[PDB]
């Protein structure tokens, strides 16, 4: 039970623990399933003294309960205590993966094979989390889990938001943001990210590292150079579209210089993810469809959601105690007893 001066108890279904990469509410080690005979991973989580931590736990898990796809991490167990008094801390149970693109991309530069059935995998469990009208919102490296070149999964649906291109009023990954996040909840920011993701793989480095959001703009702007007033125009928030203006105007650094390596057919489908309008960028069966991956590409071998995506209750207005009783029920399918 004990794990570097800590208590886990995940017993005694779960043992022969080993500490690995620790989270971010808890922290996360390597179990031996008995019941399956399989080592698998195990999430502690400690979310309750704060609000936004039981939005995030319990955003993950009605996601991924309902969620099945190939590559989407998925939930195999929650150990938690029988009564909403005694527990402080939830465990979530997930298949093993090895590591993740974050860490594979520090030791290795990848090659044009790797890096299109990446792609693919990415795009494909994309293709299902649209599909369920849901948006991840923090798509990123560490984000995505890896077993073998033919083994991803998608994984932190802390931020995953229910679409709504007319909810206008936290923040996610700056390297990964897309500008209309930062100039005025769609689509479009997921397709940016894996933009990202895609010029990272092709180079082993960020291809926007700001060190805040204005300094986020200024990389952007300067490989796709000054936008155009069509462009310009669809920035609602002034003090942006007339902040800059004054825009030491920039020309579009072209794709083929900044990666003279790349296939020039990834290269132009980074190129559609990286459009600066968001109602002109591609979306995510355009992108399936586009040349680049034309050897993987298969609709029939693509599952979608049964049912569009749809929280029972919306959470973002609801106290930490209101939450943590959300999270005790959904949960209460995984306890001894449970009916209905
Ligand atoms: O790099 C991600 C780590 C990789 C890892 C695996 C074994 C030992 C050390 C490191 N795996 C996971 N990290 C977080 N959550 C998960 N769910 C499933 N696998 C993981």
New binding site residues.
Partial sequence: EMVRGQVFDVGPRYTNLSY??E?AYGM?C?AYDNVNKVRV?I?KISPFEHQTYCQRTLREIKILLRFRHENI?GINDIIRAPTIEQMKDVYIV???????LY?LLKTQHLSNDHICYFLYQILRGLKYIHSANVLHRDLKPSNL?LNTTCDLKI?DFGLARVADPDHDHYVATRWYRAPEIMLNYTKSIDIWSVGCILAEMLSNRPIFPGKHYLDQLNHILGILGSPSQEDLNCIINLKARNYLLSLPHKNKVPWNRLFPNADSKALDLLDKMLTFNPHKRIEVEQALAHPYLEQYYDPSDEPIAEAPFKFDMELDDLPKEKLKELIFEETARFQPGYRS
């Fill in positions: 690995i990469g989270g996360v390597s991973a999430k991490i997930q298949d093993l993966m090895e590591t993740d860490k889990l994984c």
